[PDB]
Write a protein that binds this ligand. Structure first.
Ligand code: CL
Ligand code: CL
Ligand code: CL
Length: 150
């Protein structure tokens, strides 16, 4: 079971969106998927309204109990892939872990995902997260898995 963690600054906008979009395209039995924040700055707060609204609009199930959670030393050891939503998340992930795990740290998509904390365009965010989740699936799953879904 591959263990994937999407990461952004506050874990209320982009990275939770990736968690639940990814969870909608691959089974809990073959991939374990969570999300985290690099910072403290939103800890305990629920998914941002813009991500919640997007997920409801596209009928993507999510855990209403989900709250912003900062990534921990345990997480860096446990997760196989720690995927930052933009290059700032990637850099901060590497420094806060003193570069001990750089080979598990990835950028979600080349060029990045625009930050809807600034653009407020959660539709653009959804479309890019949805496509990037598809790419991660083709990257992380075996060819045999790909050929039988769907
Ligand atoms: Cl944020
Ligand atoms: Cl990067
Ligand atoms: Cl790979």
């Amino acid at each position: 079971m591959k263990k994937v963690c999407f990461v952004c600054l506050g874990n209320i906008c982009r990275s939770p969106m990736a968690e639940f979009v990814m969870k909608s395209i691959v089974s809990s039995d073959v991939m374990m998927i969570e999300s985290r924040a690099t910072s403290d700055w939103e800890h305990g707060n629920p998914i941002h309204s813009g991500t919640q609204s997007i997920l409801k609009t596209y009928q993507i199930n999510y855990d209403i109990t989900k709250c912003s959670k900062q990534i921990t030393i345990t997480d860096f050891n446990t997760f196989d892939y720690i995927i930052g939503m933009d290059s700032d998340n990637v850099k901060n992930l590497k420094e806060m872990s003193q570069h001990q795990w750089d080979s598990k740290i990835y950028l979600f998509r080349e060029g990045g995902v625009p930050d809807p904390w600034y653009t407020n365009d959660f539709e653009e965010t959804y479309q890019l997260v949805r496509k990037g989740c598809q790419d991660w699936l083709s990257r992380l799953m075996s060819k045999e898995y790909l050929e039988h879904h769907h």
